[PDB]
Amino acid sequence: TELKGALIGCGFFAVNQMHAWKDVKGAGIAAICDRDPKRLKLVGDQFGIERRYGDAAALFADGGFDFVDIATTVQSHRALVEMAAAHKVPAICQKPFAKSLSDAKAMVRTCENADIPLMVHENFRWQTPIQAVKAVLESGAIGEPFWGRFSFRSGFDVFSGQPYLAEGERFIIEDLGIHTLDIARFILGDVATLTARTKRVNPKIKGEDVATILLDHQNGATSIVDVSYATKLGTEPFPETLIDIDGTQGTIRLSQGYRLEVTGPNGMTISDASPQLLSWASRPWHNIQESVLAIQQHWTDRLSSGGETSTSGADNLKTFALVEAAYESAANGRTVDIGAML
Amino acid sequence: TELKGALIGCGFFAVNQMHAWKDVKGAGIAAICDRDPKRLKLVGDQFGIERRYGDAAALFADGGFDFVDIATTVQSHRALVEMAAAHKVPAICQKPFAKSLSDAKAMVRTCENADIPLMVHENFRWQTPIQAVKAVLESGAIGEPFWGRFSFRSGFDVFSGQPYLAEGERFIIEDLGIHTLDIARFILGDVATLTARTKRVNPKIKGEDVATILLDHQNGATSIVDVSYATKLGTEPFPETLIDIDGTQGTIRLSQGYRLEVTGPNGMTISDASPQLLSWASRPWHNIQESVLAIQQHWTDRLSSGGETSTSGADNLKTFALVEAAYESAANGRTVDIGAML
Ligand SMILES: NC(=O)c1ccc[n+]([C@@H]2O[C@H](COP(=O)([O-])OP(=O)(O)OC[C@H]3O[C@@H](n4cnc5c(N)ncnc54)[C@H](O)[C@@H]3O)[C@@H](O)[C@H]2O)c1
Ligand SMILES: NC(=O)c1ccc[n+]([C@@H]2O[C@H](COP(=O)([O-])OP(=O)(O)OC[C@H]3O[C@@H](n4cnc5c(N)ncnc54)[C@H](O)[C@@H]3O)[C@@H](O)[C@H]2O)c1
Ligand SMILES: O=C1OC[C@](O)(CO)[C@H]1O
Ligand SMILES: O=C1OC[C@](O)(CO)[C@H]1O
Ligand SMILES: [Mg+2]
Ligand SMILES: [Mg+2]
Numbered sequence: 001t002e003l004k005g006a007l008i009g010c011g012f013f014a015v016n017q018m019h020a021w022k023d024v025k026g027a028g029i030a031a032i033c034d035r036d037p038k039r040l041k042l043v044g045d046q047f048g049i050e051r052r053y054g055d056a057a058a059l060f061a062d063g064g065f066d067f068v069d070i071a072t073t074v075q076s077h078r079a080l081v082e083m084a085a086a087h088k089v090p091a092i093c094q095k096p097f098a099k100s101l102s103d104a105k106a107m108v109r110t111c112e113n114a115d116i117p118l119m120v121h122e123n124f125r126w127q128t129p130i131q132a133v134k135a136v137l138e139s140g141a142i143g144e145p146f147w148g149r150f151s152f153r154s155g156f157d158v159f160s161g162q163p164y165l166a167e168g169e170r171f172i173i174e175d176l177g178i179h180t181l182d183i184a185r186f187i188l189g190d191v192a193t194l195t196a197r198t199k200r201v202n203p204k205i206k207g208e209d210v211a212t213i214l215l216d217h218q219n220g221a222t223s224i225v226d227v228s229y230a231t232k233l234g235t236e237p238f239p240e241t242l243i244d245i246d247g248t249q250g251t252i253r254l255s256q257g258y259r260l261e262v263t264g265p266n267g268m269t270i271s272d273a274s275p276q277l278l279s280w281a282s283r284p285w286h287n288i289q290e291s292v293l294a295i296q297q298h299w300t301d302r303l304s305s306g307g308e309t310s311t312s313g314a315d316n317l318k319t320f321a322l323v324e325a326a327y328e329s330a331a332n333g334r335t336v337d338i339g340a341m342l
Numbered sequence: 343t344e345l346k347g348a349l350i351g352c353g354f355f356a357v358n359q360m361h362a363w364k365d366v367k368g369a370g371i372a373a374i375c376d377r378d379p380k381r382l383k384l385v386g387d388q389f390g391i392e393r394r395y396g397d398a399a400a401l402f403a404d405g406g407f408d409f410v411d412i413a414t415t416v417q418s419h420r421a422l423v424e425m426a427a428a429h430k431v432p433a434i435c436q437k438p439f440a441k442s443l444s445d446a447k448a449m450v451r452t453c454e455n456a457d458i459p460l461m462v463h464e465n466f467r468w469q470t471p472i473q474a475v476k477a478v479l480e481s482g483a484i485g486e487p488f489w490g491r492f493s494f495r496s497g498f499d500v501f502s503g504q505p506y507l508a509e510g511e512r513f514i515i516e517d518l519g520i521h522t523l524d525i526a527r528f529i530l531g532d533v534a535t536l537t538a539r540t541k542r543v544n545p546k547i548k549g550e551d552v553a554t555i556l557l558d559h560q561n562g563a564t565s566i567v568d569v570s571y572a573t574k575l576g577t578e579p580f581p582e583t584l585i586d587i588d589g590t591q592g593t594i595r596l597s598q599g600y601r602l603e604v605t606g607p608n609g610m611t612i613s614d615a616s617p618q619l620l621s622w623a624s625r626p627w628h629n630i631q632e633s634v635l636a637i638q639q640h641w642t643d644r645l646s647s648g649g650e651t652s653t654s655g656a657d658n659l660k661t662f663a664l665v666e667a668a669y670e671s672a673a674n675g676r677t678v679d680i681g682a683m684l
Contacts, residue, residue: 231594
């Protein structure tokens with residue numbers, strides 16, 4: 001009756017996903033897979049998984065699972081998604097989805113031709129505060145949106161837990177800004193044109209750690225997506241995304257501390273949009289950790305109902321195009337048409 | 343010794359300039375001029391000015407003043423500055439300086455040819471809080487700046503006091519954005535390239551009331567200038583400009599209620615950068631009103647010492663270039679080279 005999952009990639013963040021898989025009603029992890037046997041043992045012992053594999057080929061060979069959860073780094077995403085599609089196994093794939101938009105399109109096509117669902121684990125839009133902003137705007141409380149700011153300015157050491165982030169020529173837009181752009185899309189709709197600027201401030205890394213992006217939404221709204229890992233503040237907001245929205249009849253302001261302020265024609269309300277601290281969660285990551293449960297529960301529900309997921313492979317293409325457009329615009333200096341990429 | 347000014351254009355805002363000239367040490371107003379005899383008489387009686395002129399030509403013929411203060415709307419600025427230059431009378435001119443960058447350049451050249459000081463009355467940079475942001479950044483408290491935001495988002499009815507604002511094809515950038523762009527230059531240095539997006543939300547006006555501008559500064563910093571007169575907030579912040587700067591060693595945050603937060607290698611400090619309330623001032627205009635005295639004292643000090651003003655006609659060209667470029671960019675969707683325009 002309960003769905004049997006396999007998780008490929010028993011890394012740092014997979015721990016959160018395994019915890020959340022327990023909590024998910026209607027699904028559970030029956031097998032795990034990691035290339036590194038030290039990590040394969042650590043996650044296997046912590047969560048009590050009998051079926052353990054050193055390689056995905058062997059995992060897919062034995063089968064006996066209804067979906068696969070791909071939590072590896074981007075290098076192996078294309079191959080694993082192609083293995084999932086070849087074996088008719090529904091697939092979740094971590095962000096970043098593919099190395100390029102081209103790779104992502106081919107991965108989406110293969111899943112559509114194989115008639116299997118594909119969800120990108122894109123969990124920032126599933127955070128409680130972000131969901132609450134969506135709910136307010138959708139209700140018509142502030143009228144039609146015309147301007148937005150989506151901001152993530154931090155000085156937190158993400159590099160200890162994720163050392164590959166300090167490594168490449170690309171960093172903040174690919175790692176983090178991908179989330180902020182997904183949120184911009186989620187709240188204000190798809191993007192027509194995009195223009196971006198990037199900068200490297202931190203001397204200890206190779207890639208860019210500041211990006212300011214200006215989005216022209218198809219509905220007429222303009223927004224700012226500004227992200228930074230070189231912002232030294234007196235109160236560290238990591239990993240909060242702060243959101244301002246102006247509409248024809250009012251405003252939404254999601255400020256630091258999950259404080260949601262809404263002004264409209266009938267006055268002004270202040271509310272607490274904080275995440276629940278789950279038993280297995282840990283501050284300040286508890287915001288992200290709740291959303292892992294939300295998105296994995298959403299996956300499990302949608303697989304039973306047989307409907308399209310929110311951050312599906314097909315949908316997530318429209319987020320990833322913005323990431324590639326941003327890198328292009330930053331190197332060029334010029335505005336980039338998003339529609340011509342897709 | 344006591345300088346004698348003539349003021350041309352006895353309008354709404356001239357009243358603030360006249361109160362301020364009273365308070366200025368080393369200068370006062372010996373004559374006034376306006377085409378509208380109701381305004382000439384109202385302002386003449388309020389401030390006890392004996393010499394009153396129905397036209398600037400006759401004023402300049404009689405003379406007996408050491409400088410001229412042009413507080414008319416933009417239409418008259420070119421002619422009055424050209425009259426000043428021909429009569430070798432130092433001139434202050436209100437914003438917007440000229441109708442176009444061409445007109446501005448010719449006005450600047452004419453004053454340089456005649457060897458007379460020309461200052462644009464551009465008073466937002468002379469506000470106590472804006473000056474404090476400059477002082478902090480100048481001191482090296484936050485290191486080299488790399489990112490900024492300069493924001494003026496309001497829903498205040500500016501149209502009652504200034505009806506002309508509701509009538510033009512152009513509105514927020516030439517009226518207000520001009521100030522915010524001047525502040526961006528003042529804080530982060532001159533701009534190499536610029537891109538802008540505009541919108542009309544308010545159905546009772548002819549011009550754009552929302553503008554989002556992305557600046558690439560010559561020193562390598564990126565900045566957002568975002569302005570709006572269609573933003574409906576719980577607390578109305580008019581007419582405060584909010585400022586965020588991020589530097590290599592810290593952050594500056596000038597937030598609503600004139601709160602100034604500076605974070606550096608030592609730690610955070612919180613200051614109250616509120617303006618003074620002069621005897622003749624009124625809430626909420628008192629910050630602007632104080633800055634009228636500051637810029638007018640600055641004029642008077644510099645005229646006595648023979649030095650150039652901060653917002654000189656020459657300097658103001660680099661502000662006005664950004665205004666004209668933003669309109670150009672808003673229609674094109676394209677980035678505009680500022681260097682090519684000057
Ligand atoms: N908010 C979020 O959802 C969030 C947060 C952090 C990281 N992430 C994403 O999660 C992904 C993984 O991040 P991480 O820090 O856990 O990486 P990690 O290096 O900690 O773990 C990756 C693991 O996958 C294994 N692996 C790699 N290729 C494999 C293959 N072909 N078969 C089997 N195992 C393989 C490695 O041995 C490694 O143990 C990244 O793409 C990252 O962007 C997402
Ligand atoms: N922060 C600021 O410094 C600030 C604030 C408000 C307005 N302003 C600027 O001040 C200027 C005037 O604004 P206002 O609201 O006082 O306008 P207003 O219409 O109230 O006043 C203009 C006055 O000038 C007179 N006038 C026009 N052309 C003339 C000429 N050739 N000779 C003699 N008199 C002439 C008119 O009769 C009128 O009384 C505008 O350019 C505006 O942008 C600046
Ligand atoms: O998705 C993410 O959330 C935070 C993070 O771990 C660091 O940028 C990133 O990988
Ligand atoms: O210069 C100015 O300062 C404030 C204002 O009056 C309204 O936009 C404008 O005219
Ligand atoms: Mg379970
Ligand atoms: Mg005086």
